[PDB]
Design a binder for these strands. Structure first.
Length: 117
RNA sequence: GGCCUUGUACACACCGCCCGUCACACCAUGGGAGUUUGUUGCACCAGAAGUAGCUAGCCUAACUGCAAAGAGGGCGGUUAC
């Protein structure tokens, strides 16, 4: 809430209200709307959350995965309608907010320990 | 020119035979800056399915228990090859 109240009201008018709770280090699945022609479908994007930005309607989060041997990252915008659904598969236990050190690790070295209840 | 003996790689029989360099043509081959294929010895990295061990996170028909539960099992995690 570092913006003017009018901007805050205009932004708050468009907030999603069913977002789950997740943190860096968690592995998540994102259902992404894909529209070609008149054809609509949901594509799954599963991976580790390596960064989270809490900025109200300007919130974002970065998901990293290994796809066919090639690392790929996507920075989703949390309140965008293209993000249909987010599910948390497993909760991770980490020591810092940003996990960029994972980019230089491969295989067993990049494993994230599960957070035990 | 004629007889005996002797040496000979000559027998078209010394107007014999025959060797090497240089020139011409053809063939196979050695060396050679490098270019390239296969295979292999060490050292390290990564590492599937599978097998062996550990683990106590989650889920659970046959057995025990009136029931909470227990035993057993499965999924997962983890190490070695």
């Amino acid at each position: 809430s570092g913006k003017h109240p009018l901007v805050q009201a205009i932004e708050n008018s468009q907030l999603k209200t069913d977002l789950p709770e997740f943190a860096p280090g968690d592995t998540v699945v994102v259902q992404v709307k894909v529209k070609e022609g008149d054809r609509e479908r949901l594509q799954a994007f599963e991976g580790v959350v390596i960064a989270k930005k809490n900025r109200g309607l300007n919130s974002a989060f970065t998901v990293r995965k290994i796809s066919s041997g090639v690392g790929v990252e996507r920075v989703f915008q949390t309140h965008s309608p293209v993000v249909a659904k987010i599910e948390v598969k497993r909760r991770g236990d980490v020591r810092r907010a940003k996990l960029y050190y994972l980019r230089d690790l491969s295989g067993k070295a990049a494993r994230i320990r599960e957070k035990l209840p």
